[model samples]
Target: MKQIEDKLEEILSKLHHICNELARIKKLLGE
Candidate 1:
């Protein structure tokens, strides 16, 4: 379970980064 949480944490972190980039792009596009 500990190992799984570590892996999940990385996956979630990247997902959050992707979401942040998407928001940045939308803001740049004047949305």
Candidate 2:
């Protein structure tokens, strides 16, 4: 159970990073 929880947490962390990067780029694009 703990292992699965850790994996989900890691995935969510990566997704959060991706979202942040996308947001930054979109902002730079000046939309």
Candidate 3:
């Protein structure tokens, strides 16, 4: 259970980082 939770957290963190990066790029592109 602990390992699964850790893995989920890591995945979510990476997703959030990617989302933020995409958002920044979109803003720069004036989209």
Worst 10 residues of 2 by lDDT: 22-31
RMSD of each: 1.4, 1.3, 1.4
The TM-score measured for candidate 1 stands at: 0.74
Model 3 residue runs over 4 Å out of place are none
lDDT per residue for candidate 2 within 1-31, as digits (tens), equals 9999999999999999999999999999996
lDDT of 1 by residue, 1-31 (tens): 9999999999999999999999999999995
Which consecutive 10 residues in model 3 have the weakest lDDT in total?
Answer: 22-31
Each prediction's number of clashing residue pairs: 0, 0, 0
lDDT of candidate model 1 versus the reference: 0.97
**Each prediction's Cα lDDT score?**
0.97, 0.98, 0.98
For model 3, the local distance difference test gives 0.98
Best by TM-score: 3
